[PDB]
C-alpha cells in the first residue's frame, strides 16, 4: 500500500484468502469490512497518526481523546472471488465540528471496475468518561493537511441510503439469535470488541434461506454503545419489505440496553 | 507464493495485519493457524488438487472421500509483530497406509531465523458416512509425486511433543467456558466449522491472567468429532504443571467429546 501522488488518499491491493470466503466462494461482508479497517489503519500509519484503530494525534493522547465510529455504510456490487486481487482506495474528510468521515472505493484489480463503496462517520470522545465533544480548532488543523479540501464523496447522490435515519425495531422481533458472546479472536489490540464483530452479530439473525438464495447489497449500521468482553448480546431482525429489506437491533441480553441498530438490503441471485 | 525449485514444497510471504494481532501487538495463534491453512490451500491449488480444505483427487471425489485433520501441533518461538513479513514453507509427506502429514516452518523474512514450526496428521474418510479408510494404494500414487520421498520432519527429535498421547480431562475441570456457539464467520466455503475456531474455543477457558502474563509456546490439539453449525460447546481446562494445561471440548448437552489438547506457556 501507499499514499497516492497528491498525498490526500491511500491505495492497497489484497488477494482474497481461502478462509475469507463464504459458500459462494466469494469474500464475506466481514472480510470486506476487515480490509476497509486494514487500509484505514495503513493510511493513519503512513502519515504519523496512532495506529490502535483510533487515529489520534499526540494532543488527543494527552487529553485521553479518541475517534470512534458512529456509523458504517457498505454497498457491494460484486464480492471478489477467492484468489482475486481487490484494490481499495481510502480518504478522510473533515465535516466541520461534527467530526470526520472516512470513505472507500473497492475495485477489481483486473477489470478496474468499481465493485463496492463504503462511508463511515467518526466522532471525538473521551476514552474514559465516554463523553462526546465537538472537534476543537487545534485538533482540526492537525488532520486537515491529510484530507482533500474540496468534497470527495464515495456516495454523492442527492437522497442516498448512507444518510438515512434508522428506526428502533419493535418487539416482538420476527427473527432472533440469542446469547451471542465475543471470544478473544473478536477483540482488538486494546481488548475492545472489533467493530466488524457487530456486523457479524447483526447478520446472525438473518434466516439461512435468505443467505442461501440472496446476496447482501447494502448494510447501514449505527453504533450506540460498546459491548464489553463479558457482555452477552441478543440479535433481532424483522422484514420491512424482488429485493428483501430488514430492520436490525443488537441489545444486551439482560436489561435490553441498545448497542446497535441497522438495515440490510438483499438481492436474489 | 510459489512451489520451490525442486517442486516438492511451497513458500509464501504474509504481512501481519492490524486486526490479526493481540494485546502485545503481535499475531495471535489463531492468525498463525489461519496462515498455515492458507499456505496449505495454495500448495494444493498449485499442483491441481481440490480447492476446499480437503485436498482431494478426482478419484477421491467420485468415492466421496476427503482428507480430515486428526491432529494439529504448533510451536511458536517469536510471534510476528504487526507490519512484519513472515515467510512460511510447507510440504506434505506420505506416512504409508496411516495417512499423510503436512509440515510447516515459519521464518522472519528480515532475519531469516526460524520463529515457529507446525505439523499435522491427516486421515482419509467418507464425507457422508464419516468412516475412516487406510489409503487405497491407487490414491497414494497420486499424491506421492508432490512429496519428498526421504523424510523431512519439522519436528525431528526422537521423543518430541508432537507425537505425545493426550489424556482425557476428568471432572471437575479447574476452569471452564460454557455455551460457545459458532457464527457464520466461523464456517468455511462448505459450511463446516473452520479447524482454527476449535483452537479459539480451547483457549477461551484459559484464565485472562495467564494470557496477560504468559506467551503460548506449544499447542497440541486432537480432533475427534466435528461440531455442527447448530451445536453448542463447553471448553474445559485444568492446570497440569512454565505453565501446562490439559484441555477438553465437549458438546454442552450430552457431553460428547469433540476435541482434547495440551498447551505450554512461558512467562514473558
Ligand atoms: C477517522 N480519522 C480521524 C481519520 O481517518 C484521520 N486520518 C486522516 C488521514 C489519515 N487518518
Ligand atoms: C494433506 N494432504 C492430503 C496434502 O497436503 C496433499 N498435498 C500434497 C501436496 C499438496 N497437497
Swiss-Prot record, chain A:
GO molecular function: fatty acyl-[ACP] hydrolase activity
One Gene Ontology biological process: fatty acid biosynthetic process
Alphabetical UniProt keywords: Chloroplast, Fatty acid biosynthesis, Fatty acid metabolism, Hydrolase, Lipid biosynthesis, Lipid metabolism, Plastid, Transit peptide
Enzyme Commission number, as recorded: 3.1.2.14
Source organism superkingdom: Eukaryota
Compartments, as annotated in UniProt: Plastid, Chloroplast
GO CC, alphabetical: chloroplast
Coiled coil keyword on record: no
UniProt main location, coarse: plastid
Catalytic activity of the protein: (9Z)-octadecenoyl-[ACP] + H2O = (9Z)-octadecenoate + holo-[ACP] + H(+)
Active site positions: 190, 192, 227
Homology family: Belongs to the acyl-ACP thioesterase family.
Protein task: Plays an essential role in chain termination during de novo fatty acid synthesis. Possesses high thioesterase activity for oleoyl-ACP versus other acyl-ACPs. Substrate preference is 18:1 > 18:0 > 16:1.
Record's protein name: Oleoyl-acyl carrier protein thioesterase 1, chloroplastic
Species whose genome carries this gene: Arabidopsis thaliana
Originating gene: FATA
First-to-last residue of the parent protein present: 75 to 359 of 362
Amino acid at each position: 500500500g501507499s499514499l497516492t501522488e497528491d498525498g490526500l488518499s491511500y491505495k492497497e491491493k489484497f488477494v482474497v484468502r481461502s478462509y475469507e470466503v463464504g459458500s459462494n466462494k466469494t469474500a464475506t461482508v466481514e472480510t470486506i469490512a476487515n480490509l476497509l479497517q486494514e487500509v484505514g489503519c495503513n493510511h493513519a500509519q503512513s502519515v504519523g497518526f496512532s495506529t490502535d484503530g483510533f487515529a489520534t494525534t499526540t494532543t488527543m493522547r494527552k487529553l485521553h481523546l479518541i475517534w470512534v465510529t458512529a456509523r458504517m455504510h457498505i454497498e457491494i456490487y460484486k464480492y471478489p472471488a477467492w484468489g482475486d486481487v481487490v484494490e481499495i482506495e481510502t480518504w478522510c474528510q473533515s465535516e466541520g465540528r461534527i467530526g470526520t468521515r472516512r470513505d472507500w472505493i473497492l475495485k477489481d484489480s483486473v477489470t478496474g471496475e468499481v465493485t463496492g463503496r463504503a462511508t463511515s462517520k467518526w466522532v471525538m470522545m473521551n476514552q474514559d468518561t465516554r463523553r462526546l465533544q465537538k472537534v476543537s480548532d487545534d485538533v482540526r488543523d492537525e488532520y486537515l493537511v491529510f484530507c482533500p479540501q474540496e468534497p470527495r464523496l464515495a456516495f454523492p447522490e442527492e437522497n442516498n441510503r448512507s444518510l438515512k435515519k434508522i428506526p428502533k425495531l419493535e418487539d416482538p422481533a420476527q427473527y432472533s439469535m440469542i446469547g451471542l458472546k465475543p471470544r478473544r479472536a473478536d477483540l482488538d489490540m486494546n481488548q475492545h470488541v472489533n467493530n466488524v464483530t457487530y456486523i457479524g452479530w447483526v447478520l446472525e439473525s438473518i434466516p439461512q434461506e435468505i443467505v442461501d438464495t440472496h446476496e447482501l447489497q447494502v448494510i447501514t449500521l449505527d453504533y450506540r454503545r460498546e459491548c464489553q468482553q463479558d457482555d452477552v448480546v441478543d440479535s433481532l431482525t424483522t422484514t420491512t419489505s424482488n429485493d428483501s429489506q430488514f430492520l436490525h437491533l443488537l441489545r444486551l441480553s439482560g436489561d435490553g440496553q441498545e448497542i446497535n441498530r441497522g438495515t440490510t438490503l438483499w438481492r436474489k441471485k
